[PDB]
Amino acid sequence: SKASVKITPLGGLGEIGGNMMVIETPKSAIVIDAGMSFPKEGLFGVDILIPDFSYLHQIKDKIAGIIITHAHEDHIGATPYLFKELQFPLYGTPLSLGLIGSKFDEHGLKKYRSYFKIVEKRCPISVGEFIIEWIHITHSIIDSSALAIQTKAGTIIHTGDFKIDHTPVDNLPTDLYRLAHYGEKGVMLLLSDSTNSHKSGTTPSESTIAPAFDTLFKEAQGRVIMSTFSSNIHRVYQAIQYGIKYNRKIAVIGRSMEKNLDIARELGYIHLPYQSFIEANEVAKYPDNEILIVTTGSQGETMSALYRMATDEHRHISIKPNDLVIISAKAIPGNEASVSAVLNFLIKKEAKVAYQEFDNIHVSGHAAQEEQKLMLRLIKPKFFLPVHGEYNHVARHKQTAISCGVPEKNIYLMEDGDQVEVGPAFIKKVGTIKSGKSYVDNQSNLSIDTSIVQQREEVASAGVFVATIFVNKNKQALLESSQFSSLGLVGFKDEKPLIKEIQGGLEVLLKSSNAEILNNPKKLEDHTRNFIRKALFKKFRKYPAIICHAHSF
Amino acid sequence: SKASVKITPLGGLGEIGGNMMVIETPKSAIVIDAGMSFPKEGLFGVDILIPDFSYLHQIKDKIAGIIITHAHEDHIGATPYLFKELQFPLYGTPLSLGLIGSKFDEHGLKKYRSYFKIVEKRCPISVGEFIIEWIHITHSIIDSSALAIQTKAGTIIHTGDFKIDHTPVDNLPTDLYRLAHYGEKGVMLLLSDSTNSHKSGTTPSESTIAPAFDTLFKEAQGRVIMSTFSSNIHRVYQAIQYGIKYNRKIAVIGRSMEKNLDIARELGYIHLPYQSFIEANEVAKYPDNEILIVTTGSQGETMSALYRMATDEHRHISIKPNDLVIISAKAIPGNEASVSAVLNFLIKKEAKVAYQEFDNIHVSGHAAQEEQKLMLRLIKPKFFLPVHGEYNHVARHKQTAISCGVPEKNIYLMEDGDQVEVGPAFIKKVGTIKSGKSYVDNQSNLSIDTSIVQQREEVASAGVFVATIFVNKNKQALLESSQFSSLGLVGFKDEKPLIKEIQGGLEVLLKSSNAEILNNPKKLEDHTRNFIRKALFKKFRKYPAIICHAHSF
């Protein structure tokens, strides 16, 4: 008869990013976050994946609202794509709603800005059968929040994405007293960031970058270029401040970066004088030591713009042999080779490059082991659910929690789809639902399921041999020459004559075929596809997609 | 009238691996190395690239021999593919020729073992107009050699791939006296490893792994699995030694690893007792704490076998919840995400994993800054050509050489294709030749040019809309229903009705077309492809490959 809650991860447990969780009691439910995950970044763009909203359709009538905790694409990137299907009230801080509404406007969903509900921190608010409080927490992004969620089964604490920065840039450190209060009163369950679970110590403060920026700007003798992604408002704000400190005119390239900076300037999060800024067309009018350019690309991209500038295909900015390029790309693990490619192209143009002191190692943004342990000691949860990471990350976080006196039996390692019931005296997995991903094109802004692309590559890897046969069923013979085309199987110079060698085979086969096969085009097409498949495998040791068409006209 | 040489990099300047250089005097030439480059590694295999041998056909009548310096796939992997086109005498140490002949036998080129010529170290040998001496040098692999190449223009020193290890595993440290002698006598040109140019200090000795192995084997309570690639004979030899130290029976999985180990055992490089080894089918007969398994996959692969064992699709070895898995994969930068995937699958099976102390950071294998500086001070070259790396690597190496008192004007940064003439008093680029790569399938063992694959993906990225039209030119109308198929453009559920919507369009178009278009199928096919292209772009914002076929029969 005792109460309980049901935690359903739809994204964030199996990948870094793409966070979406469902906290559900009987007759009520809330959804925490709707994020985008970036698995790879190359010279031509980034891969983007959004979660699958299939389960939300099943519990549509229990959802009391979407809870937004971070004003960043890894937590609000999927909201436009979700609101194309379902709509619920969106609780969030001003900047979070400001950047979500910007994307909504870009997507033609300005209508759903109607659903926005602003919240302030240190102010509990009733949403459904939940009492939610936003608690300020430090992180790399401009606005971050932990959640204190009171339910009749107990209080849940959701940190999710955080670091402990005692000297942040905005001088708004973590509201430590509230986190401790909830812990003294008693906490049933804690969900905590597991991204940086494998690193000991604490993560360095964002203020440890200020001296590096100051040194790089002090001794810069030409233009300064700052390459990053559209949602690094904090880093771009730190860089603009140091540009105006050394009397440099700022030129921001990229419509999304300027919008995001303007949304934050208007809402009062950042202070930026207009007179320090110029347009790209004006950069050539100023001497080189008075120029700071800030470059971004499409959503999540950093190095496509750098590659276009280093190849002279950008057509707005060209790399010059006195330039200093500061690279602050997204921490997409497995990006080193692409950074190396951009670096090669930039060194060819005789440009100095600073990239190490802005990598993921110097600032990780996510809580390291000491910060995770501080969270565990502040909250003192009875049950623990490590979130925001792959399986090995949350496993290491469970190890840390065990070292902090949390019983191993009170920690479950969730995977996307898993459903876990939590009560004031137990924790257990109760089942699985339909979880998945969907690829997203950052240029055309549409979602395509991972199944469609799996197939595109199930064939796009290996070639595709097309064929067309025209026979006269009443003569039982080829009527018009068979026609063929191929792609990706083998280079053309070896397929112009293999095309003639599979044509010969088929002409003979057809003349030698039973009239029934020739009379019914389907049997002929199946017969033909098998003939060709065997012929191509024997010649290439591949099994290309084979498409055949037969005619009897 | 003074002599000079001509250095033509065909591979190794723009990528890590795939090394092939041509040192050419008028009327004579030698080729140093024929390597394989591994740019990416995933859960299903590795990418393999070999250099383009086009220039070697032009200078075929000057080549006095192929010079092999390292017994490893990154220096001898392309030799079978090169010998399918041209043949020259192959100078090499026993193990180098032993592993090259093994691959030759696998490729059906045992005939060309006739071309082998064994060499010993500290023994100058005349090859063409060159006097070549192999000097022992330390490195991660079992046998490595620097080259001292006397020409009438001066003496060239080729280190290429090296580290300075004062306590190697074989107790055969670098022959430092010979390198110094050549330097005192005078050296015109030096080519040196630039792979690890960005790291300060010295690289740790291979003996710093022995305590880690000993600790891991001491406290292993179940089976021990050692996952690596077919050519890590040294690491697999270190691991087998520690397995027999703790009374574990060794089970080697992978035909290539056993062959390479047997080639080295017979030639006397390694000492391995037969009685310590067992077959895979026998591992279940022994208790878990008496079992060391060694796993490899295809050429260069490490984690495909691990993934198959962790998914229970291996069918010879299955991961058990007491296992300890030591990962020693190839240092292919940009592999972190794939290692993380394998790690997730292994932790799901409750297996302990050791991977950090066998990463690239703990042992780099390539000379760091102090070792590069030691080489520069030992050789004292007048001219310097940094090799074995991308552009930023060789640029950093040039910086180091400048700091070592080498004039900036005596250092050139080559790129694949560049031709550089070097004389006893000058250095300059004289032109460019045709350089390139070719992808290699590790299962079927054939080369496919990067052009063929570029195209496979120029279309395999985006979809491919096929179509067939049957018209009667004397009625000027569709005779039989048009037929269509698609792949990768959009999921099927949205293309079954778009296929009907492009069919309708075309039926009308055809009936409305000029008789000339209908009379000549080529014009009809071009007309049709353009119609469809516009229709598909408007619906998908994509430009899929479009293949059309028209019939008038």
Could you characterize what this model shows?
The structure is a homodimer of 553-residue chains. With 553 residues, chain A is α/β, with parallel strands linked by helices. Among the domains of chain A are: 206-358, Metallo-hydrolase/oxidoreductase (Rossmann fold, 3-Layer(aba) Sandwich); 457-551, Ubiquitin-like (UB roll) (Roll), CATH 3.10.20.580. Helices cover 31% and strands 25% of the residues of chain A. Chain A has 16 helices and 26 strands. In chain A, the strands form 5 sheets. Chain A has an 8-stranded mixed sheet. A 6-stranded mixed sheet of chain A has the order 8-9-10-11-12-19. Chain A has a 6-stranded parallel sheet with strand order 15-14-16-13-17-18, with helices on both faces. The first copy, chain A, is globular. Chains A, B: Zn(2+) 1 binds at residues 70, 72, 139, 161.
Strands, helices and their partners?
Two copies of one chain form a homodimer.
Chain A: E1 5-11, E2 20-25, E3 28-32, E4 49-51, H1 54-58, E5 63-67, H2 73-76, H3 79-83, E6 90-92, H4 94-107, E7 116-118, E8 125-127, E9 130-136, E10 145-151, E11 154-158, H5 176-185, E12 187-193, H6 210-218, E13 224-227, H7 233-245, E14 249-253, H8 255-266, E15 277-278, E16 291-295, H9 303-310, E17 324-327, H10 336-348, E18 352-354, H11 369-379, E19 381-387, H12 391-403, E20 418-423, E21 426-432, E22 437-440, E23 447-449, H13 450-460, E24 464-472, E25 477-487, H14 492-511, H15 515-519, H16 521-540, E26 545-551
Parallel strand pairs in A: 3-5, 5-6, 6-7, 11-12, 12-19, 13-16, 13-17, 14-15, 14-16, 17-18, 24-26
Antiparallel strand pairs in A: 1-2, 1-20, 2-3, 4-22, 8-9, 9-10, 10-11, 20-21, 22-23, 24-25
Helix pairs in contact in A: 4-8, 6-7, 9-10
PDB class: hydrolase
Keywords: RNase J, Helicobacter pylori, RNA metabolism, hydrolase
Assembly: dimeric
